[PDB]
Amino acid sequence: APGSLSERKNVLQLKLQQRRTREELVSQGIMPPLKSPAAFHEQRESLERARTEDYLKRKIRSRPERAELVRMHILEETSAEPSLQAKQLKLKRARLADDLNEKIAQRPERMELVEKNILPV
Amino acid sequence: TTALVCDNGSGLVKAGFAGDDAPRAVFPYPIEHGIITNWDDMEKIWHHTFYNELRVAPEEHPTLLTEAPLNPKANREKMTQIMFETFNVPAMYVAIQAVLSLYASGRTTGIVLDSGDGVTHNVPIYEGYALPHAIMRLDLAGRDLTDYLMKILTERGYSFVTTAEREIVRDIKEKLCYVALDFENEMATAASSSSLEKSYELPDGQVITIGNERFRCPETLFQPSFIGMESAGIHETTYNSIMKCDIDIRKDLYANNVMSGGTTMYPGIADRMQKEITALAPSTMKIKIIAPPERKYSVWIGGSILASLSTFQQMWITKQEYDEAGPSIVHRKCF
Amino acid sequence: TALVCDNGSGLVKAGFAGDDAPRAVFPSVGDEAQSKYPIEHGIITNWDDMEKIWHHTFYNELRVAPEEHPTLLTEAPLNPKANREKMTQIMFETFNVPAMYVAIQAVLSLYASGRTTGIVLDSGDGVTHNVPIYEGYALPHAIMRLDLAGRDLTDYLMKILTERGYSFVTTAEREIVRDIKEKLCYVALDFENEMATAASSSSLEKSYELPDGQVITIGNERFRCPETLFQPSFIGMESAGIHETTYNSIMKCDIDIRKDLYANNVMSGGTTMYPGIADRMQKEITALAPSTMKIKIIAPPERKYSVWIGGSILASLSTFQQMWITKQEYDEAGPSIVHRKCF
Amino acid sequence: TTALVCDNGSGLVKAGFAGDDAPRAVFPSIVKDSYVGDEAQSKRKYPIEHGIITNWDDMEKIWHHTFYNELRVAPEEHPTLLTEAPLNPKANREKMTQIMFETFNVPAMYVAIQAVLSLYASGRTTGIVLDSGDGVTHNVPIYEGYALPHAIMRLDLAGRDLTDYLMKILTERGYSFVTTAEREIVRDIKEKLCYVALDFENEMATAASSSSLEKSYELPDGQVITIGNERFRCPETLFQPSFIGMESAGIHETTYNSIMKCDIDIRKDLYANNVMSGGTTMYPGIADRMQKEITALAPSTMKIKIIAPPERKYSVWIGGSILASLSTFQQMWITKQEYDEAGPSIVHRKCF
Ligand SMILES: Nc1ncnc2c1ncn2[C@@H]1O[C@H](COP(=O)(O)OP(=O)(O)OP(=O)(O)O)[C@@H](O)[C@H]1O
Ligand SMILES: Nc1ncnc2c1ncn2[C@@H]1O[C@H](COP(=O)(O)OP(=O)(O)OP(=O)(O)O)[C@@H](O)[C@H]1O
Ligand SMILES: Nc1ncnc2c1ncn2[C@@H]1O[C@H](COP(=O)(O)OP(=O)(O)OP(=O)(O)O)[C@@H](O)[C@H]1O
Ligand SMILES: C/C1=C/C(=O)O[C@@H]2C[C@@H](CC[C@H](C)/C=C\CC1)O[C@@](O)([C@@H]1CSC(=O)N1)C2
Ligand SMILES: C/C1=C/C(=O)O[C@@H]2C[C@@H](CC[C@H](C)/C=C\CC1)O[C@@](O)([C@@H]1CSC(=O)N1)C2
Ligand SMILES: [Mg+2]
Ligand SMILES: [Mg+2]
Ligand SMILES: [Mg+2]
């Protein structure tokens, strides 16, 4: 109860094996990274922040227009709404393959063409 | 006179101020699965955030809100409506969580894995643009994991079912669980020796002991079947998501796989995801998995960062703009 | 399932029938080689080399059992009967593919467009064709070839960046210039005028950051390089510009279908990705054609893979799942069978 | 074969043996050629003011005096655990190591972070320590036995300063202490009579209101002086450094900030595990007060617990002892062999 020198020793030995590795703890954002400087985690942070802020503030001005992505086939063209898209596109491909099916199915024989004044004997 | 960042999570609001490198307030369902379903409830949540957590004049600060991938236009418009009419916020803006997470990573192109409390998405994003047709949802999230850990601590004899007991098990999850590199092998080794089991002291002093459960719970993320789902594992879903993107930016994506959200904190989830994604992808593919230590709050941080840019000042939605164009304005301004 | 291999001049696009866009695209082994051309101009010239390419596709890119999947291959307009029969032979005897089939790239491109009649402009890496197709039939007598393609364009861009002082000649440097081409080049609507405006300033000149951080800057070269497609003379050719060749190709066809052809002008192949190439082609084709002619240019945003996609779509259509060439058919009739089955 | 625990304080070395419930020897940390500690005080410079070892020759003499005169032992015969201050420079630790091994041929040795030892003695591995000694005061948040440097707080306002300010305010009472001897007198007065008040303004009001607050103190030369609100004003300095001219924030504020400079996740744990150590935390009431303040700065739904072991005047050292005594711990000393094979650098890998 008092924290007798011997009992004080057992809780410790039992809690010092209950312990994760600090590697694991910066791994979880409790620890700052081993290897950086102990004083100056603050400034270090500030600085990496800046670095990022600069990148964002630039990459932002250059930001393309949706349209330009569509030009490139990044975003599907063009309506309707984000959620429907996924499906809508599957509907598109499906309906097209179908509309192609009969189209090729009912494909004239060569002589149809030849007599139709297209292509030689 | 600065900006507020509010990430409305399935399980946890993260609110704070533009600039700071972490949310000041984080507190605990009208947004299960990531989409705002109950607007009265939600309105009360926002009130509590504005007045009780951040203790601020909602009319005095611009507000950046987060929304889930594939939030319906109607939804965003509603958020906007409420911010402007129920809070007379000077201005405001709505952002896609996954995207914010990516920005905080210091990128504009990559594929995010955002696994929070009630939902998990894969969002491929390009120069800020999330590619909807490739987005993946996966209603298996953190809660579910907590549950399954309860339901498997059962085989050990322990019986947690109280809401309070649930919370206990959650803490156990967070403290001891971990994704294994090779699951079958990790099971083999599980039996082989001890050194794997750990000890956990309940609130009431009683010490329980946990074994392979540690790595089986999170394994659910890779095998949804473990909790009865025909869905594919997060890694598979990632792969599929990538592949649904234009063939040219594929490379950029395999090379820029950023993880966010609480549920991605499990030790080893990175190396594992690497293993799997690597195995599914073309043998000559650069594959990189980014797992920022700060990712339990990726989103919110990104939010902050963004709301802080001098550039970004030009793109807020002013109260005036809203008056002149109504909620619809959102669709033109935030994207 | 079924495979779809587009054995391009300088890229192989191989994927699985069904889904849109291939899985593997690699230089025509391939990249890993790049870390150390048997189909220049579009026709398979070296069969040993080609066989190695197919092996690499089957086993390294797609990682599949060649014996377990039917294979659809692409061939160039006017591929010699002997050639097709060789492809067939190799697929069946060197890969024991369950079945297979050979298709005309341009035609596939057209199908993917959702058509069976129209005139395709397929401009890849080593060759550019005009192929008029009617009810799913390519009209050979009207087909146009044009050995001016994408590589040539890359080269000429190098050769003109020279006037700017820059000196790219390494293979690596070539690749750099290629990327520059893809990222910055663009076909101009009015060339003379675009030159005038070029001198006239504002947003024309772009910057471009080399791998080693150094930023170079590019001007009218941007639109001059691709202009070569319309004036082959720019790189020393007595050939007519792609638009002229298109016109001639149409004209070399029966006059009834000509209306159809001018209203269904579909573009495919990488080299057709240059911004504005459509509007320009419209302008020119319009100016060469009869004043009362409906003229439409179709430029699907994903034409960089038109062909291959078509390949997919086609091999999905229930109908076509009857034309395949079964190993049995091949055994009973030899390579010749191809000419009866694929057309 | 029994280990030695040595806590090198700004003002007071605490040395002794592993196992022992409190340090055998405790002597002033100052320095016929050289007189150390108490003998030095007798006739007629502090090499560790502020907590960091600045003079190595002096320090070496201090260690010699500890090894040979206080503990009377064979330095070559006992492993030695030393304490170091939060944020001791890698070079410093390496120097300590060097001197222990080459100047004392100690069989083995190890260096530990005071605040952390204090925490261990509390029976914890996670919490935020307030260690307020003689020459320096720190806030050290520690998690699973690891001190979080980026959140550590230093505060050069410590015990000495308090003694001084008590002198400088006994002046308003007419008394004039300035002799080094007189200083010591005032120190004793501080330790015996001073105390942190719960509400300072109010405690002043009550100070005037009635007597019952003043106490009587007999100087060495029989003469009895009497002390009033000085009692609670001196230690109040810890909460208002301004009292002695400092733009620094009060220990409570600094504690708060230190917590805040930490992972939001672990904060709850920090708030409910606030352990105090070091002499200057012995003032009666400092606990309840710290509770008040920390409570007022923190989120209204926060479990806040202040731990003040009545023995904290030696928290550190005890912890040290405890630790040096664990069977487990025997595997992570630094052997003379290890040192020979890897040089002082070794310390950074072994102690942390
Ligand atoms: N260290 C951890 N390891 C594993 N899971 C954790 C850890 N810490 C928190 N979690 C889990 O993460 C989940 C919450 O993370 P998060 O804050 O991203 O959810 P949310 O924000 O409310 O939902 P969303 O991310 O979709 O907006 C919780 O269920 C929590 O149990
Ligand atoms: N955005 C672009 N703009 C202009 N040219 C491009 C662009 N992208 C790719 N190219 C060029 O397209 C060419 C390749 O396209 P393609 O894949 O059609 O060639 P190929 O398939 O190997 O030959 P073929 O089409 O005849 O089978 C390359 O030379 C490439 O440089
Ligand atoms: N009962 C007391 N009340 C208030 N202060 C006290 C009391 N007893 C001792 N002190 C003061 O505590 C100070 C010393 O405590 P401590 O031993 O922790 O200092 P130190 O160990 O030399 O420095 P450090 O703790 O930084 O290592 C002395 O200034 C002393 O006057
Ligand atoms: C990115 C890419 C584009 C491409 O189409 O490249 C293909 C394949 C390539 C083969 C060598 C190259 C070093 C390897 C890979 C480049 C592949 O040759 C090309 O680049 C040639 C060379 S210049 C040109 O425009 N085409 C075409
Ligand atoms: C009993 C005791 C207490 C102490 O903590 O004292 C230590 C050590 C001391 C050294 C000089 C002194 C004459 C020698 C021994 C005093 C030791 O200085 C201190 O008293 C300083 C001076 S004022 C003060 O409070 N700290 C700290
Ligand atoms: Mg989130
Ligand atoms: Mg082609
Ligand atoms: Mg101390």
PDB file of N, CA and C in Angstrom, chain B residues 256-315:
ATOM      1  N   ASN B 256       1.506   6.436 -55.144  1.00  0.00           N
ATOM      2  CA  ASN B 256       1.112   7.437 -54.174  1.00  0.00           C
ATOM      3  C   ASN B 256      -0.066   7.067 -53.284  1.00  0.00           C
ATOM      4  N   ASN B 257       0.076   5.929 -52.609  1.00  0.00           N
ATOM      5  CA  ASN B 257      -0.995   5.336 -51.816  1.00  0.00           C
ATOM      6  C   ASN B 257      -1.003   5.805 -50.362  1.00  0.00           C
ATOM      7  N   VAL B 258      -1.764   6.854 -50.088  1.00  0.00           N
ATOM      8  CA  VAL B 258      -1.775   7.475 -48.770  1.00  0.00           C
ATOM      9  C   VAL B 258      -2.917   6.966 -47.906  1.00  0.00           C
ATOM     10  N   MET B 259      -2.614   6.587 -46.662  1.00  0.00           N
ATOM     11  CA  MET B 259      -3.631   6.101 -45.725  1.00  0.00           C
ATOM     12  C   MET B 259      -4.056   7.147 -44.700  1.00  0.00           C
ATOM     13  N   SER B 260      -5.349   7.204 -44.405  1.00  0.00           N
ATOM     14  CA  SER B 260      -5.838   8.130 -43.392  1.00  0.00           C
ATOM     15  C   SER B 260      -6.886   7.461 -42.541  1.00  0.00           C
ATOM     16  N   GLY B 261      -7.412   8.207 -41.576  1.00  0.00           N
ATOM     17  CA  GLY B 261      -8.455   7.703 -40.702  1.00  0.00           C
ATOM     18  C   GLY B 261      -7.933   6.836 -39.574  1.00  0.00           C
ATOM     19  N   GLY B 262      -8.650   6.849 -38.459  1.00  0.00           N
ATOM     20  CA  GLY B 262      -8.257   6.075 -37.302  1.00  0.00           C
ATOM     21  C   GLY B 262      -7.888   4.644 -37.640  1.00  0.00           C
ATOM     22  N   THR B 263      -8.828   3.919 -38.235  1.00  0.00           N
ATOM     23  CA  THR B 263      -8.667   2.485 -38.453  1.00  0.00           C
ATOM     24  C   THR B 263      -7.390   2.084 -39.212  1.00  0.00           C
ATOM     25  N   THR B 264      -6.612   3.063 -39.669  1.00  0.00           N
ATOM     26  CA  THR B 264      -5.361   2.752 -40.361  1.00  0.00           C
ATOM     27  C   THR B 264      -4.155   2.842 -39.440  1.00  0.00           C
ATOM     28  N   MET B 265      -4.410   2.962 -38.146  1.00  0.00           N
ATOM     29  CA  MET B 265      -3.337   3.164 -37.188  1.00  0.00           C
ATOM     30  C   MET B 265      -2.703   1.847 -36.743  1.00  0.00           C
ATOM     31  N   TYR B 266      -3.360   0.730 -37.053  1.00  0.00           N
ATOM     32  CA  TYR B 266      -2.875  -0.574 -36.602  1.00  0.00           C
ATOM     33  C   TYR B 266      -1.446  -0.750 -37.070  1.00  0.00           C
ATOM     34  N   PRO B 267      -0.548  -1.071 -36.136  1.00  0.00           N
ATOM     35  CA  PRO B 267       0.846  -1.312 -36.509  1.00  0.00           C
ATOM     36  C   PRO B 267       0.944  -2.403 -37.572  1.00  0.00           C
ATOM     37  N   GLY B 268       1.744  -2.147 -38.601  1.00  0.00           N
ATOM     38  CA  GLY B 268       2.001  -3.135 -39.630  1.00  0.00           C
ATOM     39  C   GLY B 268       1.056  -3.079 -40.815  1.00  0.00           C
ATOM     40  N   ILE B 269      -0.058  -2.363 -40.666  1.00  0.00           N
ATOM     41  CA  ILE B 269      -1.044  -2.254 -41.743  1.00  0.00           C
ATOM     42  C   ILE B 269      -0.402  -1.759 -43.036  1.00  0.00           C
ATOM     43  N   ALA B 270       0.628  -0.930 -42.881  1.00  0.00           N
ATOM     44  CA  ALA B 270       1.362  -0.382 -44.010  1.00  0.00           C
ATOM     45  C   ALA B 270       2.080  -1.494 -44.756  1.00  0.00           C
ATOM     46  N   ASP B 271       3.023  -2.140 -44.079  1.00  0.00           N
ATOM     47  CA  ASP B 271       3.841  -3.177 -44.691  1.00  0.00           C
ATOM     48  C   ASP B 271       2.983  -4.250 -45.335  1.00  0.00           C
ATOM     49  N   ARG B 272       1.887  -4.581 -44.662  1.00  0.00           N
ATOM     50  CA  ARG B 272       0.938  -5.567 -45.151  1.00  0.00           C
ATOM     51  C   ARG B 272       0.307  -5.084 -46.441  1.00  0.00           C
ATOM     52  N   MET B 273      -0.294  -3.898 -46.385  1.00  0.00           N
ATOM     53  CA  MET B 273      -0.907  -3.304 -47.565  1.00  0.00           C
ATOM     54  C   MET B 273       0.079  -3.311 -48.738  1.00  0.00           C
ATOM     55  N   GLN B 274       1.340  -3.035 -48.429  1.00  0.00           N
ATOM     56  CA  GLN B 274       2.413  -3.086 -49.406  1.00  0.00           C
ATOM     57  C   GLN B 274       2.484  -4.471 -50.009  1.00  0.00           C
ATOM     58  N   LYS B 275       2.640  -5.465 -49.147  1.00  0.00           N
ATOM     59  CA  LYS B 275       2.693  -6.846 -49.590  1.00  0.00           C
ATOM     60  C   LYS B 275       1.578  -7.130 -50.586  1.00  0.00           C
ATOM     61  N   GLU B 276       0.341  -6.916 -50.151  1.00  0.00           N
ATOM     62  CA  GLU B 276      -0.824  -7.299 -50.940  1.00  0.00           C
ATOM     63  C   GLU B 276      -0.928  -6.527 -52.254  1.00  0.00           C
ATOM     64  N   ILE B 277      -0.913  -5.200 -52.160  1.00  0.00           N
ATOM     65  CA  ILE B 277      -1.009  -4.350 -53.342  1.00  0.00           C
ATOM     66  C   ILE B 277       0.075  -4.738 -54.340  1.00  0.00           C
ATOM     67  N   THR B 278       1.273  -4.991 -53.818  1.00  0.00           N
ATOM     68  CA  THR B 278       2.401  -5.447 -54.618  1.00  0.00           C
ATOM     69  C   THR B 278       2.047  -6.736 -55.353  1.00  0.00           C
ATOM     70  N   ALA B 279       1.449  -7.680 -54.638  1.00  0.00           N
ATOM     71  CA  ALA B 279       1.123  -8.970 -55.227  1.00  0.00           C
ATOM     72  C   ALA B 279       0.025  -8.883 -56.294  1.00  0.00           C
ATOM     73  N   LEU B 280      -0.860  -7.895 -56.181  1.00  0.00           N
ATOM     74  CA  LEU B 280      -1.942  -7.765 -57.159  1.00  0.00           C
ATOM     75  C   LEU B 280      -1.507  -6.993 -58.395  1.00  0.00           C
ATOM     76  N   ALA B 281      -0.496  -6.143 -58.240  1.00  0.00           N
ATOM     77  CA  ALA B 281      -0.099  -5.223 -59.303  1.00  0.00           C
ATOM     78  C   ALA B 281       0.948  -5.812 -60.248  1.00  0.00           C
ATOM     79  N   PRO B 282       1.059  -5.234 -61.455  1.00  0.00           N
ATOM     80  CA  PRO B 282       2.073  -5.554 -62.474  1.00  0.00           C
ATOM     81  C   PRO B 282       3.500  -5.575 -61.911  1.00  0.00           C
ATOM     82  N   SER B 283       4.237  -6.645 -62.191  1.00  0.00           N
ATOM     83  CA  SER B 283       5.512  -6.915 -61.519  1.00  0.00           C
ATOM     84  C   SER B 283       6.567  -5.814 -61.661  1.00  0.00           C
ATOM     85  N   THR B 284       6.342  -4.880 -62.577  1.00  0.00           N
ATOM     86  CA  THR B 284       7.296  -3.804 -62.787  1.00  0.00           C
ATOM     87  C   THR B 284       6.661  -2.480 -62.396  1.00  0.00           C
ATOM     88  N   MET B 285       6.099  -2.437 -61.194  1.00  0.00           N
ATOM     89  CA  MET B 285       5.362  -1.267 -60.747  1.00  0.00           C
ATOM     90  C   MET B 285       5.917  -0.695 -59.454  1.00  0.00           C
ATOM     91  N   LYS B 286       6.269   0.583 -59.472  1.00  0.00           N
ATOM     92  CA  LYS B 286       6.664   1.252 -58.246  1.00  0.00           C
ATOM     93  C   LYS B 286       5.450   1.331 -57.319  1.00  0.00           C
ATOM     94  N   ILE B 287       5.563   0.733 -56.137  1.00  0.00           N
ATOM     95  CA  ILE B 287       4.473   0.758 -55.173  1.00  0.00           C
ATOM     96  C   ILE B 287       4.892   1.331 -53.827  1.00  0.00           C
ATOM     97  N   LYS B 288       4.267   2.435 -53.439  1.00  0.00           N
ATOM     98  CA  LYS B 288       4.622   3.109 -52.200  1.00  0.00           C
ATOM     99  C   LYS B 288       3.391   3.344 -51.332  1.00  0.00           C
ATOM    100  N   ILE B 289       3.475   2.955 -50.059  1.00  0.00           N
ATOM    101  CA  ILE B 289       2.387   3.203 -49.126  1.00  0.00           C
ATOM    102  C   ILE B 289       2.775   4.261 -48.104  1.00  0.00           C
ATOM    103  N   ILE B 290       2.015   5.349 -48.079  1.00  0.00           N
ATOM    104  CA  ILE B 290       2.286   6.459 -47.179  1.00  0.00           C
ATOM    105  C   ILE B 290       1.409   6.399 -45.935  1.00  0.00           C
ATOM    106  N   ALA B 291       2.036   6.294 -44.772  1.00  0.00           N
ATOM    107  CA  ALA B 291       1.271   6.242 -43.536  1.00  0.00           C
ATOM    108  C   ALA B 291       1.787   7.241 -42.517  1.00  0.00           C
ATOM    109  N   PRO B 292       1.371   8.500 -42.672  1.00  0.00           N
ATOM    110  CA  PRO B 292       1.763   9.566 -41.754  1.00  0.00           C
ATOM    111  C   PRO B 292       1.365   9.206 -40.341  1.00  0.00           C
ATOM    112  N   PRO B 293       2.315   9.303 -39.412  1.00  0.00           N
ATOM    113  CA  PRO B 293       2.050   9.167 -37.984  1.00  0.00           C
ATOM    114  C   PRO B 293       0.818   9.978 -37.601  1.00  0.00           C
ATOM    115  N   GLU B 294       0.698  11.177 -38.169  1.00  0.00           N
ATOM    116  CA  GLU B 294      -0.366  12.101 -37.793  1.00  0.00           C
ATOM    117  C   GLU B 294      -1.732  11.776 -38.418  1.00  0.00           C
ATOM    118  N   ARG B 295      -1.953  10.528 -38.819  1.00  0.00           N
ATOM    119  CA  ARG B 295      -3.103  10.228 -39.678  1.00  0.00           C
ATOM    120  C   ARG B 295      -4.455  10.007 -38.984  1.00  0.00           C
ATOM    121  N   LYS B 296      -4.431   9.713 -37.698  1.00  0.00           N
ATOM    122  CA  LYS B 296      -5.660   9.712 -36.931  1.00  0.00           C
ATOM    123  C   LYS B 296      -6.364  11.060 -37.109  1.00  0.00           C
ATOM    124  N   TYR B 297      -5.678  12.021 -37.726  1.00  0.00           N
ATOM    125  CA  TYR B 297      -6.257  13.342 -37.970  1.00  0.00           C
ATOM    126  C   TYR B 297      -5.817  13.969 -39.302  1.00  0.00           C
ATOM    127  N   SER B 298      -5.250  13.142 -40.184  1.00  0.00           N
ATOM    128  CA  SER B 298      -4.938  13.533 -41.562  1.00  0.00           C
ATOM    129  C   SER B 298      -5.914  14.593 -42.023  1.00  0.00           C
ATOM    130  N   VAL B 299      -7.118  14.133 -42.346  1.00  0.00           N
ATOM    131  CA  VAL B 299      -8.187  15.004 -42.791  1.00  0.00           C
ATOM    132  C   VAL B 299      -8.105  16.359 -42.137  1.00  0.00           C
ATOM    133  N   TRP B 300      -8.412  16.400 -40.850  1.00  0.00           N
ATOM    134  CA  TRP B 300      -8.571  17.680 -40.200  1.00  0.00           C
ATOM    135  C   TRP B 300      -7.369  18.583 -40.424  1.00  0.00           C
ATOM    136  N   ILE B 301      -6.170  18.044 -40.234  1.00  0.00           N
ATOM    137  CA  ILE B 301      -4.950  18.796 -40.496  1.00  0.00           C
ATOM    138  C   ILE B 301      -4.943  19.404 -41.889  1.00  0.00           C
ATOM    139  N   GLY B 302      -5.157  18.564 -42.902  1.00  0.00           N
ATOM    140  CA  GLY B 302      -5.309  19.041 -44.265  1.00  0.00           C
ATOM    141  C   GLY B 302      -6.264  20.213 -44.279  1.00  0.00           C
ATOM    142  N   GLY B 303      -7.487  19.988 -43.819  1.00  0.00           N
ATOM    143  CA  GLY B 303      -8.442  21.064 -43.682  1.00  0.00           C
ATOM    144  C   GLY B 303      -7.755  22.320 -43.194  1.00  0.00           C
ATOM    145  N   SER B 304      -7.188  22.261 -41.993  1.00  0.00           N
ATOM    146  CA  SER B 304      -6.509  23.405 -41.401  1.00  0.00           C
ATOM    147  C   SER B 304      -5.576  24.051 -42.402  1.00  0.00           C
ATOM    148  N   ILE B 305      -4.551  23.302 -42.794  1.00  0.00           N
ATOM    149  CA  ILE B 305      -3.583  23.744 -43.791  1.00  0.00           C
ATOM    150  C   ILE B 305      -4.255  24.544 -44.900  1.00  0.00           C
ATOM    151  N   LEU B 306      -5.230  23.928 -45.562  1.00  0.00           N
ATOM    152  CA  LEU B 306      -5.939  24.533 -46.684  1.00  0.00           C
ATOM    153  C   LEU B 306      -6.633  25.839 -46.327  1.00  0.00           C
ATOM    154  N   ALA B 307      -7.406  25.821 -45.245  1.00  0.00           N
ATOM    155  CA  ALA B 307      -8.131  26.995 -44.781  1.00  0.00           C
ATOM    156  C   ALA B 307      -7.172  28.113 -44.396  1.00  0.00           C
ATOM    157  N   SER B 308      -5.886  27.781 -44.305  1.00  0.00           N
ATOM    158  CA  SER B 308      -4.877  28.744 -43.882  1.00  0.00           C
ATOM    159  C   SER B 308      -4.154  29.421 -45.046  1.00  0.00           C
ATOM    160  N   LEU B 309      -4.200  28.807 -46.227  1.00  0.00           N
ATOM    161  CA  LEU B 309      -3.509  29.348 -47.393  1.00  0.00           C
ATOM    162  C   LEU B 309      -4.055  30.719 -47.764  1.00  0.00           C
ATOM    163  N   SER B 310      -3.156  31.651 -48.054  1.00  0.00           N
ATOM    164  CA  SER B 310      -3.565  32.963 -48.534  1.00  0.00           C
ATOM    165  C   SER B 310      -4.367  32.806 -49.819  1.00  0.00           C
ATOM    166  N   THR B 311      -3.870  31.965 -50.721  1.00  0.00           N
ATOM    167  CA  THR B 311      -4.576  31.629 -51.953  1.00  0.00           C
ATOM    168  C   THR B 311      -6.043  31.336 -51.663  1.00  0.00           C
ATOM    169  N   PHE B 312      -6.260  30.327 -50.830  1.00  0.00           N
ATOM    170  CA  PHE B 312      -7.588  29.819 -50.509  1.00  0.00           C
ATOM    171  C   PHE B 312      -8.588  30.886 -50.073  1.00  0.00           C
ATOM    172  N   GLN B 313      -8.095  32.014 -49.572  1.00  0.00           N
ATOM    173  CA  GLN B 313      -8.973  33.119 -49.184  1.00  0.00           C
ATOM    174  C   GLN B 313      -9.911  33.556 -50.308  1.00  0.00           C
ATOM    175  N   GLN B 314      -9.488  33.341 -51.546  1.00  0.00           N
ATOM    176  CA  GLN B 314     -10.280  33.785 -52.681  1.00  0.00           C
ATOM    177  C   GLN B 314     -11.485  32.883 -52.931  1.00  0.00           C
ATOM    178  N   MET B 315     -11.485  31.688 -52.343  1.00  0.00           N
ATOM    179  CA  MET B 315     -12.477  30.674 -52.708  1.00  0.00           C
ATOM    180  C   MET B 315     -13.505  30.346 -51.638  1.00  0.00           C
TER     181      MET B 315
END
